[PDB]
Design a protein around this nucleic acid. Structure first.
Ligand code: MG
Ligand code: MG
Ligand code: MG
Ligand code: MG
Ligand code: MG
Ligand code: MG
Ligand code: MG
Ligand code: MG
Ligand code: MG
Ligand code: MG
Ligand code: MG
Ligand code: MG
Ligand code: MG
Ligand code: MG
Ligand code: MG
Ligand code: MG
Ligand code: MG
Ligand code: MG
Ligand code: MG
Ligand code: MG
Ligand code: MG
Ligand code: MG
Ligand code: MG
Ligand code: MG
Ligand code: MG
Ligand code: MG
Ligand code: MG
Ligand code: MG
Ligand code: MG
Ligand code: MG
Ligand code: MG
Ligand code: MG
Ligand code: MG
Ligand code: MG
Ligand code: MG
Ligand code: MG
Ligand code: MG
Ligand code: MG
Ligand code: MG
Ligand code: MG
Ligand code: MG
Ligand code: MG
Ligand code: MG
Ligand code: MG
Ligand code: MG
Ligand code: MG
Ligand code: MG
Ligand code: MG
Ligand code: MG
Ligand code: MG
Ligand code: MG
Ligand code: MG
Ligand code: MG
Ligand code: MG
Ligand code: MG
Ligand code: MG
Ligand code: MG
Ligand code: MG
Ligand code: MG
Ligand code: MG
Ligand code: MG
Ligand code: MG
Ligand code: MG
Ligand code: MG
Ligand code: MG
Ligand code: MG
Ligand code: MG
Ligand code: MG
Ligand code: MG
Ligand code: MG
Ligand code: MG
Ligand code: MG
Ligand code: MG
Ligand code: MG
Ligand code: MG
Ligand code: MG
Ligand code: MG
Ligand code: MG
Ligand code: MG
Ligand code: MG
Ligand code: MG
Ligand code: MG
Ligand code: MG
Ligand code: MG
Ligand code: ZN
Lengths: 99, 138, 99, 124, 208, 83
RNA sequence: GGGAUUGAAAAUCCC
RNA sequence: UUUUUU
RNA sequence: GGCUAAUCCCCCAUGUGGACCCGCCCCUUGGGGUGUGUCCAAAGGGCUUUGCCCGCUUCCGGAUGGGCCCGCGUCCCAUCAGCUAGUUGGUGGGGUAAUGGCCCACCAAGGCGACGACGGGUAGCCGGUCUGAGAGGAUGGCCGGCCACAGGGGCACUGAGACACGGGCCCCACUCCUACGGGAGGCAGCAGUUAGGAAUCUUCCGCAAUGGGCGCAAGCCUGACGGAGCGACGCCGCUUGGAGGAAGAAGCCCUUCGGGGUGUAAACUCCUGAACCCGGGACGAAACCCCCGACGAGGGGACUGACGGUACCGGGGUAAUAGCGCCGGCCAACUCCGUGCCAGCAGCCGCGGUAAUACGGAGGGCGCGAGCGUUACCCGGAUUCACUGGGCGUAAAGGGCGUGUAGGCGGCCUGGGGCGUCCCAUGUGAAAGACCACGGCUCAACCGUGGGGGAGCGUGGGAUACGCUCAGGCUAGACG
């Protein structure tokens, strides 16, 4: 008995918390940016959406989102902001989006 | 309506030869005629020619038989010992050029319908084509 | 070579979708006679162009739904309802032969 | 049958029924005897044929013929079944192996010893 | 192991002189002399007309027993000829004649096939310089079948090759008598063999 | 990782190897990508080593990896000789 | 179980 | 009555 | 609860480049380019420490492995005939590497079935194998490929990859510990145990080879593997002597009582020398590494055996296991006695109720031979499910008759098309196997190298007689 592939399951749990946290941040920030687009606030929506983007690629640096899985999140996010901003557009910050 | 005009012609011949009729008529069609051309070329019939029988075209097929024979049953040996339609309607038989049969170990023929025309088995094989296997004759 | 089939539209009644019936002819593997088999394909019609009775080319396509892997290439022959009526009669025969 | 028919229905392979339900289709099966009887035979012949009812490891209960001139088979002895019918006794489909667990071979049998399960004797 | 037992008895059951005894199948004792009938209590009785099978069987036994071969090696040898290009009949013969045990006999190194079979087994035979102790070895055309110089002084070898002076050898064979050498020139033909056997009977015996 | 190695194809006590390109993850006697030569260790035949170098050079340009043994035989047929 | 009985056996008859 | 038409 | 290192984790920076929104261009399903805007990089260690080695980061490409999709083929029952609610489609969304009713919300009312749906039964599939003249039938052990499963059921985490045999969680059955609160297990890995069973092996040696994991490397791990062991379980090779030897011993057996048979068989004469003894004694092994050259090419050198003191070579050298079935016909081999519808044989037809070539023994003979018989199963014979290749008046088999749906089938002439059909090329058809050739074990079985074939499907081009199809025409079939 007592194989020290047990050490592997130990690290498994450590990495579980790392991936789970960053993902929890992505979701919590993404929805925050969209709630502002839907409520019209253009500057705050953008300034937030940029930090969601950064947190996404940062999660793709390691083993959390490593693939184009991260670009999937970025793609779906930036669409809904610009579209939800289309009720009284006025895209103030215009940081993350293109002219 | 005639169900299969070819096997009908093949039979009109098969039946004529057994009572030894000099000639026999089969209703005219080009594809029929192209078969009789192969027979007449192979010496199974004296020949054939077109005729009108009460306003409609037919083909007079002239059958040849062997010499009269010796004691009982003088009736002659047949030139066409066997005719059988192969590819019938409702079961069609096509062969590639390697699927062509050797009839009677070379002594008979197998009439083929090919894209290059109606041929014997030999003529087909040296033409390098295959097709629908109409009949054995020997 | 994406597989390309040519059949007839037998069902109109979906949204952005038409049923194509495609006949097939092959010699039987033992008995040799040429036999005629049919298969119904669910083809994608995004403009609702194609109607009942149109004979259409069908092309192997990237999946659209469950049971939809072909799209409508083009129209071969327009509006021959005879093909449909042979199929409808056949479907209608199944209403006997139960009880 | 027209070719069309042969396409619609086709031929039907003939399922051969086994003549020996020694289950698991095994080559033999060991069983325990119930009775040891002597059966009157079929019409053209007459004798006292020694047989045995056997309970099988396949869960079967069948008659078996006891070959040889004399047997030691008792009411409770265990035996091995062979298969092969006694033509002139109806319902007897399986022979019994002589020279197996409790069925000794035939004493003093000198000609065919593979059958009837007897060893090779010595000659002085 | 091949058949081991009386032999001039099987001379009889086939009805044709067998030479497996070597000499004395020549001297008037072969038992084919003044006893041509088959063995057994009923050997002197008048035999019934053999069945169509009976003839084909005695003909193969006639051939199998001449070369001193078991059925196993015999039938495997035959099924080889049916596959090979050429007449299954005569191809079978050339394959039996290619046996090293038979070659030794055919060369006069040994009185009989049985004696030749022991000579190979005990290593007294060289094949292209190498010792070969298997009688089933297939001799190829061109191979040199000598005697081992170890036994070249053995009196049984000098005995046969003293009687082999002046004797002619087969048109597919040649040998040097002093150095005890010998060569397998080519495979033998139907006409090359004198065997008293109808091959077309034995071919027909395996059609069943 | 695609590797160049040997696959055992003789019999007991009579080994013969096939120099072979295959993924290192497959069994040693299992399906391979290409056979690029043979090896007879007992050197029983005059030709007991063949390669087809120009083919073996290909799989190196794309990054196949030879065993310590497979390389020893390739260098004999001069796969690396560059003069 | 033994005789009559039949080629033999059943059945039948005798200690 | 039952086997064996010799 | 407290201290700490890092190739552990994080923030800023640099933007070759990439990711995302939007615009444009070329392509044409989400492929390639481009502009503005936003977002994203990293880790050090080692020595022969001024330079090189093992690494790290972002990107494009190669290779290899794989996910998903599609056409076609894939057993029995119709005494299973109707199935379907995420079920069929749509819009939008979640999710994944990615399409998708994969999941979800809302809308439409569809989808499938006699060309066999739904249900039941059975079953991993294939390369192949066995058989057969072939068409076909049967089969899927070993070896090779794909799949699925890890006591039963469900689920996720980690990760490039798993929903993971020897990883994790929970439910259930069972075994063990138990301070009765609670815990630990999971040989369908190698051996081995027990149970079932007619029946299936060693608790073996070895890291020397080949392969795999980590490592600069030295090396470590490897029940993959290579070997040995046991079992006639199969194939193949080999021995149980060879030559001389009586018109013919003894014993047994038959007999017309003359004799016949076992039989050149034994005895005996001569030669060889399986076992066994003695000595020599392998190939499989050359690299990884060290030195020279730059740690490259190349050269040089050294260590490295389980099998095993086995194979093999040389010397010496003894006449030295034979069995099993059958002998009425098919089917090759016959006589005596014993037994009397008994005892028994029997694959089928049948033997045996006083002369049995059939039961039982003997003598003899036939057939194989380290085997020989048997039982079970598979194909064959069986043209007895008939495509090649059968039938239906009396032998098994024409439906009691009609009307007619679907389906099958289609007279004569022309033209277009080229779906079936045929031809050329081409890709594919892995290896092994099967076939021919040659070669390595003294032969063979076994193994190696080379050669050729192959239906099927993809693709490009070509032919148009016949079948199909569209257009036209005829009157011999049918109808009026
Ligand atoms: Mg570790
Ligand atoms: Mg929250
Ligand atoms: Mg993940
Ligand atoms: Mg035919
Ligand atoms: Mg030509
Ligand atoms: Mg519609
Ligand atoms: Mg389109
Ligand atoms: Mg109803
Ligand atoms: Mg069917
Ligand atoms: Mg059953
Ligand atoms: Mg059963
Ligand atoms: Mg019976
Ligand atoms: Mg031949
Ligand atoms: Mg040839
Ligand atoms: Mg010659
Ligand atoms: Mg092996
Ligand atoms: Mg793999
Ligand atoms: Mg070389
Ligand atoms: Mg190079
Ligand atoms: Mg703490
Ligand atoms: Mg740039
Ligand atoms: Mg940055
Ligand atoms: Mg890091
Ligand atoms: Mg790929
Ligand atoms: Mg079944
Ligand atoms: Mg349901
Ligand atoms: Mg409902
Ligand atoms: Mg539901
Ligand atoms: Mg339900
Ligand atoms: Mg979607
Ligand atoms: Mg994943
Ligand atoms: Mg999507
Ligand atoms: Mg269908
Ligand atoms: Mg089921
Ligand atoms: Mg089951
Ligand atoms: Mg199963
Ligand atoms: Mg064969
Ligand atoms: Mg199968
Ligand atoms: Mg489970
Ligand atoms: Mg469940
Ligand atoms: Mg990893
Ligand atoms: Mg899944
Ligand atoms: Mg799994
Ligand atoms: Mg385990
Ligand atoms: Mg594991
Ligand atoms: Mg646990
Ligand atoms: Mg037990
Ligand atoms: Mg290694
Ligand atoms: Mg070092
Ligand atoms: Mg260990
Ligand atoms: Mg092993
Ligand atoms: Mg043997
Ligand atoms: Mg002798
Ligand atoms: Mg001596
Ligand atoms: Mg060496
Ligand atoms: Mg240096
Ligand atoms: Mg070097
Ligand atoms: Mg080493
Ligand atoms: Mg020696
Ligand atoms: Mg002796
Ligand atoms: Mg006989
Ligand atoms: Mg018997
Ligand atoms: Mg008596
Ligand atoms: Mg008597
Ligand atoms: Mg007897
Ligand atoms: Mg056997
Ligand atoms: Mg059978
Ligand atoms: Mg058949
Ligand atoms: Mg047949
Ligand atoms: Mg038929
Ligand atoms: Mg019949
Ligand atoms: Mg009637
Ligand atoms: Mg009618
Ligand atoms: Mg109709
Ligand atoms: Mg027509
Ligand atoms: Mg039609
Ligand atoms: Mg035309
Ligand atoms: Mg075409
Ligand atoms: Mg091709
Ligand atoms: Mg192959
Ligand atoms: Mg050789
Ligand atoms: Mg080959
Ligand atoms: Mg084409
Ligand atoms: Mg018309
Ligand atoms: Zn003789």
């Amino acid at each position: 008995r007592n194989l020290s592939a047990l050490k592997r399951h130990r690290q498994s749990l450590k990495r579980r918390l790392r991936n789970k946290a960053k993902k929890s941040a992505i979701k919590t920030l993404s929805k925050k940016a969209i709630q502002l687009a839907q409520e019209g606030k253009a500057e705050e929506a953008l300034k937030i959406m940029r930090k969601a983007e950064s947190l996404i690629d940062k999660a793709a640096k390691g083993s959390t989102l490593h693939k184009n899985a991260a670009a999937r999140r970025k793609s779906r996010l930036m669409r809904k902001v610009r579209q939800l901003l289309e009720a009284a557009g006025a895209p103030l910050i215009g940081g993350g989006l293109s002219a | 309506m005639l169900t299969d005009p070819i096997a009908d012609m093949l039979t009109r011949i098969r039946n004529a030869t057994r009572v030894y009729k000099e000639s026999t008529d089969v209703p005219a069609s080009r594809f029929k005629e192209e078969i009789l051309r192969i027979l007449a070329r192979e010496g199974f019939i004296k020949g054939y020619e077109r005729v009108d029988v009460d306003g409609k075209p037919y083909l007079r097929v002239y059958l040849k038989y062997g010499p009269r024979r010796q004691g009982p049953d003088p009736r002659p040996e047949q030139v066409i010992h066997h005719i059988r339609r192969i590819s019938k309607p409702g079961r069609r038989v096509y062969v590639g050029v390697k699927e062509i049969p050797r009839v009677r170990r070379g002594l008979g023929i197998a009439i083929l319908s090919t894209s290059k025309g109606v041929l014997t088995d030999r003529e087909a094989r040296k033409l390098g084509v295959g097709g629908e296997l109409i009949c054995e004759v020997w | 070579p994406k597989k390309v089939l040519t059949g007839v539209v037998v069902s109109d009644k979906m949204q952005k979708t038409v049923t194509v019936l495609v006949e097939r002819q092959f010699p039987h593997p033992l008995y040799g006679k040429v036999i005629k088999r049919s298969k119904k394909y669910l083809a994608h019609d995004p403009e609702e162009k194609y109607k009942l009775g149109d004979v259409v080319e069908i092309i192997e396509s990237r999946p659209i739904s469950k049971r939809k892997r072909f799209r409508v290439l083009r129209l071969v022959e327009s509006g021959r309802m005879d093909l449909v009526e042979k199929y409808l009669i056949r479907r209608q025969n199944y209403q006997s032969l139960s009880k | 049958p027209t070719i069309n028919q042969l396409v619609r229905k086709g031929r039907e392979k003939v399922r051969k029924k086994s003549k020996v339900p020694a289950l698991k289709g095994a080559p033999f099966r060991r069983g325990v005897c119930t009775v040891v009887r002597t059966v009157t035979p079929k019409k053209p012949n007459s004798a006292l044929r020694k047989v045995a009812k056997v309970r099988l490891t396949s869960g079967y209960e069948v008659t078996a013929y006891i070959p040889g001139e004399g047997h030691n088979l008792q009411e409770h002895s265990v035996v091995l079944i062979r298969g092969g019918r006694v033509k002139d006794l109806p319902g007897v489909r399986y022979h019994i192996v002589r020279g197996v667990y409790d069925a000794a071979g035939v004493k003093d049998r000198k000609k065919s010893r593979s059958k009837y399960g007897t060893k090779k004797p010595k000659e002085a | 192991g091949r058949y081991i037992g009386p032999v001039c008895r099987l001379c009889r059951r086939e009805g044709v002189k067998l030479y497996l005894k070597g000499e004395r199948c020549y001297s008037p004792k072969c038992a084919m002399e003044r006893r041509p009938y088959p063995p057994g209590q009923h050997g002197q009785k008048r035999a019934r007309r053999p069945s169509d099978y009976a003839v084909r069987l005695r003909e193969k036994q006639k051939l199998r027993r001449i070369y001193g071969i078991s059925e196993r090696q015999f039938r495997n040898l035959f099924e080889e000829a049916s596959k090979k290009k050429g007449v299954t009949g005569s191809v079978f013969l050339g394959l039996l004649e290619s046996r090293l045990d038979n070659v030794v006999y055919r060369l006069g190194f040994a009185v009989s096939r049985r004696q030749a079979r022991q000579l190979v087994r005990h290593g007294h035979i060289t094949v292209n310089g190498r010792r070969v102790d298997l009688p089933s070895y297939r001799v190829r055309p061109g191979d040199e079948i000598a005697v081992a110089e170890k036994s070249r002084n053995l009196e049984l070898i000098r005995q046969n090759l003293e009687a082999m002076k002046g004797r002619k050898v087969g048109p597919w064979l040649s040998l040097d008598v002093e150095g005890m050498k010998g060569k397998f020139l080519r495979l033998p033909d139907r006409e090359d063999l004198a065997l008293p056997v109808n091959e077309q009977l034995v071919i027909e015996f395996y059609s069943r | 990782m695609v590797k160049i190695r040997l696959a055992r194809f003789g019999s007991k006590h009579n080994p013969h190897y096939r120099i072979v390109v295959t993924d290192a993850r497959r069994k040693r006697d299992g399906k391979y990508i290409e056979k690029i030569g043979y090896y007879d260790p007992r050197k029983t035949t005059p030709d007991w080593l063949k390669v087809d170098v120009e083919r073996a050079r290909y799989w190196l340009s794309v990054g196949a990896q030879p065993t310590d043994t497979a390389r020893r035989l390739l260098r004999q047929a001069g796969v690396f000789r560059q003069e």
